[PDB]
Amino acid sequence: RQSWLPGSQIPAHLDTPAAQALAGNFGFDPLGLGKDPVALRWYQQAELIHCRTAMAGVAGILIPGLLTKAGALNVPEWYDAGKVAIENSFAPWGSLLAVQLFLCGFVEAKRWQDIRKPGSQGEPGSFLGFEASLKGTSELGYPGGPFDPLGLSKEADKWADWKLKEVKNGRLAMLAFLGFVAQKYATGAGPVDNLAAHLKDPWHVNYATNGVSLPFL
Template identity: 60%
Template sequence: MNATMLKSSFVSGVAARPQLPTPFRSNGSRVCMRVNAEAQLSGNWLPGAENPKYLEGLPASYGFDPLRLGQDPGALEWYKQAELIHCRYAMAAVAGILIPDVLNKLGALNLPDWWNAGKVAQDNSPIPFNTLIALEIFAYNFVEIKRWQDFKKPGSQSEKGSFVGLEGFFQGSGENGYPGGIFDPLGLSKGPGFEAMKVREIKNGRLAMIAFLGFTGQYLATQKGPVDNLIDHLKAPLANNFTTNGVSLPIQAHPLLTVLHP
């Protein structure tokens, strides 16, 4: 076979080769790979598994219910509301930890560390501790009863006579867990993007719950807040991480890592 025949055979083979999908085609010396994260997450949390039918329609569920706790429709609705409330509490807590901590570092504020803030506030409060606890229990009980009543009968808390003439403030969005009214000053529950906002809230809330657990674990391990931990890690990543705090791992960190600490 001469050189001309070899060249012709090679060209024919290249022409007959199936084209790669667009995301994997070579572009010069670099392979362009585009991954749509949202499309990847739109399926099941466990690749190859089938989404439970009873989770269809829930924002950002991704079929995650390995213990099948949501098979009971009544229980599923309560779990949905419980996650929503925990998400909101966690987002408020994480913001309440990070924002003052950052402002302290910038010199704009001088507030106590988050794990000590409650004690400092109580030491400077004119209200005795036992009285404060009683007031908080009463307030939380009132709010939770109102939430439970609205859960059992959505919209009932805006009915006339349900709250000493102020029930108009509880005029909700009509959907359980999304109060609307004065709790939605921007009117996001009325716009076309309401469903997308639900997904964003759940995702950010889950991240906040994990972050709060991380903040708690960091303090127990290092006696520092998240901003200080981040600054220490950025200064010396190998010397300041979960392997070197003496708590996270059941084994002692390698002695060489301590040498790297500035």
Template identity: 40%
Template structure:
């Protein structure tokens, strides 16, 4: 599915590599699956009385950065935002390096965790004890089936997020 013609799997017609688009679909699907659950969790937990009412907000009201000092964190919200951007930037940089040179991130020294980061050679599915602690997909057939399920669930989660956006606009 490429309505804008950004890639050309048959030759050099497009300017985005199809492998990069497939990789992006897997990564964005994972974020969408986390976001779909995370968007409704505060409301559900608030209705069950498991979290304070002031934090049991609809998802579209939680993204506003509150004035400094509203919540009791170790720093003000702007410092937390910059800290989060630095950590996410580091993780995304390493992820891109692994896409450009598959398997390279498992070989570099990283706080003594290299053994757990050693992966499958496919950057979208890093494998290793940290990313697959239960050992799913032991053979090729089951791994292929799990990959297909992940892509389908990711697509469904992306549509769920669109539904959340529409609901926020309508209500």
């Protein structure tokens, strides 16, 4: 099958039916973190959550950052948007962070108890009418019901394809956010400006020339 290195030996914990049936399996565990199956289940879940919030974050970076170079959407830089928004806002950032900690902690603890027990949040009586539509969908980390409204996960002949598109776009968006942080510290401009500079002069404006990323040369 496909692998992150042709010719390297695939680790024996990533070559089982439970590991090969997951999503995006290419045999990449050189540090051996997923040798424990309980750890691999927990890390599957952590990867899915980092994938989805990284895609949402990097979309919030790029689409306002692309459209601010066109006419509409005068949006500040992503490392200035918190300051500009909290000047525009009504609440202090501490109160806004406290509200998001409570509202996220509720939902997070729901997901946490679903990871602990899969058939957990469907106790009859524990929710007003949520309780029927808060079980899993036989695969943990892929809930149903109000999550996924449009029924795209109903056809089984598309399902591994949707999984693998999600895990690839998520890993690529995580690389994009680590890039956003790194470029921000190195260059001092926005990522669309970094892309415009690498398109204006590729052979002279890159990380070999910024004077930060490799300072021995």
